[PDB]
DNA sequence: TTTTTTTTTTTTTTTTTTTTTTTT
């Protein structure tokens, strides 16, 4: 799927430089071919001229140019979608979550967007026929909701073993957002020894909200934010992943998602929430690149998310 | 438990750092953690260079990292529940109130908060065999309702001896919000000397309502309580009791809690109290990540929290 | 159209020097006639006495001096204008979008901005008796939301053939800011051999946010910014054809687009697009040189831009 | 009301000397008697005892001496002013635009400074009772943004020709600042040939911003820019023209014109346009050596600039 | 006042060799006194044998020699002193503008500087009672700001007629660096026939900056510039009147006026203007041999220079 | 403390040979002994034997052979030491200013090198109690900025009465070079009938800059200038006072002074001058034949030049 | 064989928050 970074190690190149490069934070050789010339300055040791090379070597294996819109379509028809476990949801959105982009759900309280990553983290592992990706999950919590029984409960209508099913889901907790924001190197680190198919992050808001406080304080959270959200999309072009990510609301003196501008205009599908009638729920397509706004209804039950019976 | 916080004193950093720093209200190696780097560059007589070294010192003694769910699953089936002292109240929490997290009680007038709170401050010192804690109690008061008498009553039933029931349990009165802010630092001065089992809020939003009036103070409110519930919060990592605070309602214009959307969001565990016939009562889960809805009922009598007769 | 380059190889200069130019990123007799001397001298192999005579001759292919302004009024009446797809649109801009400018388009997520530059990749190519153009599309993506599915619907309600269509965009995605400024000299190149009629960006400020973050680097950025702004202008006077950018907005601490006073005195068209009811969308004409302010409105269909039904 | 350059051959110097003189820029024997003798010993051909010829002939016929201050206020007292097309604004003024000195216009985008350069490319050439010139105008466009649709519309409302209006217009587009500064030659050719009375350039600093980028290239476009603007006064002074010029703003890190003390220093009298509601705007009086501070109103309408309502 | 130069033919001396002396700009006979021997040897007709006789008569009428302080004291007790028109301004400065020395005003534009000129260029004329000096102005332009306009309504404030006021101010326009030098020989050939009593050199940088261009010509510059103010001091020492010149400002890449050491090393008194809030203006003392740094205000209005109010 | 000339009238000698030495400038018998006979050649009068028999004379009274060191070190200790006003300077220059050798101030533009001469001129009359030379001044003014006023309140500080301290200076003025130099002769005529200690030159290369302009006439300006600097050792040698000096300054293409290595060479003790805050000013050592290279700090007040509080 | 001089010039915006309270 990637090109190995070792393979940028001719004419001069030794492995001293890639040690260095790894400490940075780069795993791959895309990753440094995404890289301005300015961010590969700012490591203690790399000079001038290797920066050079090394932007040189890179865009020999990895391919940046025109194509046409053919070939482009050709290579999109093959992108794999991830099942939600409900029909209605699946039509709703084409197929299910698409892997590549990034898709926020947000809602009130108890409107079911922490049972459905639970779900997503166990149909992430099934064979391609059913809908799956046979792949590992990384989830980073940031409120303490995550509870393996659920898991336990949601694997055995999909026939796994539980202990399979544990095994291949690597959990973290964060306590501020600057550990948030390191967390994502570790993730690169991991996502170039095993195939992985899934990231989550529940939720992308919650720590900024008092790690800054009032107006004077604005600027910078917004900035710090905005770093987040294109270290995921790169991750995403890296290595071929899905990406799911959960908001909070707030009232307007109903009520509407926290994060502003920045929030907004960095996600690529957006799905808003609403309670219904015992365990149902709604679910409304609020942006979209190429689906039309409509409306369905899903259902929580014991063994996951589901059609209303 | 916890790790102590004089062991942050390897090198470059003396017992006037360590005072410094229980100043500034830390008093684990935890909570240098879990703070981030712009908090630390705070104190005077911390400035740079130093705060870089607390950092990279109680991250080789606290874990911050990723693990396995398998893992996470077997250390969290260790944690200790607390009885209620009703059979169908234990059964519908799924063994009581759980260590590590936060419970939210609210309801009308009369409808037995607080007994049950009186009844929690008693079952947290008896032995882990018949449902108990082994430890002490805090009791903030914001309402004026603390009634030692009944404490006598319910300990003469689980065979505890009444002065020592009286001697283990710490109780406060506050009268603003700063004053009540400021008495956590205090409990967690405490908790570090002793071991501690059950925190009490009663009850949270009392004094803010007369606090802040009008649309005007509206978002000053809101941040302040963000900052209680986060410290709270960190309480609960740090030390491994169990929280539990208590609320009131207002009118639509039938009965909603108050608070919006930061209490609502902040809450692990949500139930709502009814009145019904004679000494009786009803009870309902409205939010939990890992249990369905349902209701049942239990009553008040001179000895406590008990199942109808 | 332009007048190619080969006709310069006269009075001593010989295919080498063109090699040369055409390295240094020219294409053409009028990109030598509109640069300055300090611009030749720092390419290797023009020493002095050769920029001179390239200068001279360029002069005389093409012409530089003065012209009375009913000549130019009557240049200026052969100008192309590409359909929109809307009526109401293309009356409010007086026929369509123009050739030889640069028109810009702002506004809040989700208000139509990425649907437009689709049905102008398509309308792009039809005749010019129905309001076309009769060339080929350059398309840069520097968000990855460019879809070829709603190329497919677009062009079969304007009667072309979906292959042909496909096979006369080209694409391109952007992952910094200098890649973004590398790839326009490819685009002249492309330009060259075959002819097109439109180039789109979309957007242009997204990276710019974070490549240059915070006070200190806000000069730097604008320069860029200035520089990429002054290459798009030299390829609409060198080509004949249309550009058409997008933008983001922010808040007022009641939203204004970004990227300061160089990127409004830049533009020679300004629109603001608003959300309206259901599939409603409003448009505003906020700056031009001929035009009066005014409004109006259009919809989005599965087959593109439209007249509200 | 200028000498001819035909009256320096007299004693000594032939249609050799002329000649070259002509090709070298001058036109007019107020031109020989206004430059330097350092200047004159610079072109091929020209040398000493000549050199000292033509400076002495040239004082013969214009005059450069003491005269009293009672004569100057009379010889001062008969100079047009050019009306604007509205009558606050012409009060404001004390009459309208002055021939023989240099007026600036700045402001933000959109706030009228091109449409008052379009008017009064018309006004110039009307009859002298009515507030006109009765002469030529020359226009210099460095940015594109010029419309003879304009032109045509407001020529009606004065009762002009439009075939005439746009034949008595010249126009050149400039490219880069070398050709910018190139252009003033062929004005001065041009003018000895036919009465003009206005010259425009619109706007002065957009090509030096990128022709000259950073720190290190500040001294060497400061030099130029006074070049430029030395040459203007002097074809003010040899012709009896007006000038008018615009510029562009930046912000204070609320807004500032650019181009230093240079640019202040050099203009005799400015000008600060403001956006007002609807089609109105607002004009300052900035600088000025015989008028105070004060403001009024204008608008913009379909004919031209003109009073509000 | 001074010893005319006719008294020099005595000895042998002729009518013809006065004249030869006129013909190269001396006037009065301190000025032959005041002379080198190798400058006198520098006209035609005049050898040696002849200036050893010139210069040792001319020694016999004006004294060179040693005297007693308390001799100066007593002579420069009787100097007079011209007033500003503020009374702020005239308590700063001692008493007002001293004759016999230089004064320089610099600031930026619209400080007031080319106003209070135009207020002394009046104020020379009134009766020695009042403050004035009653004698006649001359003023040297290089810029092209006077305007007699001003001068009739600061008349009409000192009871002055406007006609005489008109009519007793010699003004002259400079168009390069060789005429200025040029004009002043005129100047002393016309104050040997009529008492003045004030010169004005309005900017005298303004022309040099474009007449020596960039670094490689700085040295001819700076020597131009040092003749011309030495003759400027020379024509002070001759007849006893005040000397008021102009100066520019540039950035320190926090402003600076322009010049060097040669203009800072030569200029007797140092002022500079700043702007203040609506019409009042603030002046610092920069240099003096006898008085201390101060400031004060004053203001603009339509009859001259004033009091704040 | 010198021989008169008129103690060298012995058998062949009369008094018109002393007249007419007189005449040449020759006051003393140590300025015949001084002087070379090729010197005594141009005296008109004096051929031979006459210039051989006053060189035998002068001999035996002024002592010209070897001494012993001690005896030299024993009478260089009855030398005097003028102060300055100033503690600290009188420390850093190892007491004041000494008789018998030159010393030379340099520095910028109201640096404080004339005030500093201004107090001299005053304390150089003080008793020798107090740091004082019970003599008289001579001052010789090249710019124009003597000022008897500051004289007058320095007198009142040091208790002498103003009336008589101002008849004790005396005071000229030199128009140019050849005036400078002449000025020489009748000050040594002054100093040979009543008793002097200080002589002050400011400044010393004023004239020199523009009575020699460019390269071509230099090397004769340097000659010139070390004939006037021998004449002034001299005239310290033969009368025992004090000598001073001022400079200016010029910027390297950060300054530095002017002259040459003539007046570095020539100098005994040179001190540079600088700005500081307020009215305080730097002073440094920068040459001395027997001193260190330190700073110090003083101030300018309205009674001269002091400590800095 | 000889003998140093003399400063200049401004640039360029960012970025949302947060519910209250029964009546006959
Ligand atoms: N084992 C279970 N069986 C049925 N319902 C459950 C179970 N566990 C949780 N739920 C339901 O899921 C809801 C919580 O949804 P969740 O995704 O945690 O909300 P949020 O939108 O705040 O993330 C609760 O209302 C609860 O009733
Ligand atoms: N000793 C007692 N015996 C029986 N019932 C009691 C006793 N003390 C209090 N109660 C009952 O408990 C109720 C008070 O409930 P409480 O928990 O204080 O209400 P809240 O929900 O406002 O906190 C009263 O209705 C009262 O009847
Ligand atoms: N196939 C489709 N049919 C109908 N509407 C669509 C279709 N695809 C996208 N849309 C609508 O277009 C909107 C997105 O507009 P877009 O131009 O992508 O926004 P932006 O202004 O951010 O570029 C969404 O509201 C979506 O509902
Ligand atoms: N034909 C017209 N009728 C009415 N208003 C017009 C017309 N053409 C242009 N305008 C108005 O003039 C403004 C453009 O001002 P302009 O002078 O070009 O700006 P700038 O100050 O940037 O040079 C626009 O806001 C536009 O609405
Ligand atoms: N008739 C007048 N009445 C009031 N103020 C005036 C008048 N004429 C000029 N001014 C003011 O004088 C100022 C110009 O000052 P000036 O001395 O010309 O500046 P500079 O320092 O550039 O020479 C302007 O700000 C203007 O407002
Ligand atoms: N009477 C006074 N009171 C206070 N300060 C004075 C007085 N006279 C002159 N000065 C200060 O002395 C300084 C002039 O120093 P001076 O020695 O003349 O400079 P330079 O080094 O050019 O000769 C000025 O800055 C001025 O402020
Ligand atoms: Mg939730
Ligand atoms: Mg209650
Ligand atoms: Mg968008
Ligand atoms: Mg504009
Ligand atoms: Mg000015
Ligand atoms: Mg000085």
Chains 1, 2, 3, 4, 5, 6 share one sequence.
């Not at 795993?27 to 920066?51: C, F, M, N, Q, W």
């Not at 294996?61 to 699946?90: Q, W």
């Amino acid at each position: 799927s990637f090109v190995p970074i070792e393979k940028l190690q001719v004419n001069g190149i030794t492995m001293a430089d890639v040690k260095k490069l790894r400490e940075s934070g780069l795993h791959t050789a895309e990753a440094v071919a995404y890289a301005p010339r300015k961010d590969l300055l700012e490591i203690k040791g790399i000079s001038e001229a290797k920066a050079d090379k090394l932007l040189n070597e890179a865009a020999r294996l990895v391919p940046m140019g025109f194509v046409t819109a053919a070939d482009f379509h050709m290579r999109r028809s093959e992108l794999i979608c991830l099942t939600t476990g409900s029909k209605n949801l699946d039509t709703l959105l084409g197929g299910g979550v698409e892997t590549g982009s990034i898709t926020e759900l947000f809602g009130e309280f108890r409107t079911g967007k922490s049972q459905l990553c639970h779900t997503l983290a166990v149909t992430c592992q099934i064979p391609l026929d059913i809908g799956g990706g046979e792949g590992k999950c990384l989830y980073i919590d940031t409120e303490g909701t995550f509870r393996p029984v659920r898991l336990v409960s949601i694997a055995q209508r999909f026939g796994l073993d539980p202990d399979d099913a544990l095994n291949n889901v690597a959990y973290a907790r964060a306590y501020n957002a600057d550990h948030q924001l390191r967390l994502l190197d570790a993730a690169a680190q991991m996502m170039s020894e095993s195939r992985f198919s899934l990231i989550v992050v529940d939720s992308v808001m919650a720590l900024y909200r008092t790690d800054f406080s009032g107006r004077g304080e604005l600027s910078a959270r917004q900035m710090h934010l905005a770093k987040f959200m294109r270290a995921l999309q790169r991750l995403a072009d890296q290595f071929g992943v899905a990406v799911v990510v959960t908001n909070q609301v707030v009232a307007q003196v109903p009520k509407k998602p926290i994060g502003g501008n920045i929030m907004a205009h960095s996600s690529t599908t957006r799905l808003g929430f609403k309670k219904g009638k015992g365990c149902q729920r709604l679910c409304k397509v609020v942006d979209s690149p190429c689906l039309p706004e409509a409306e369905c209804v899903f259902a929580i039950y014991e063994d996951g998310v589901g059609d209303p019976r």
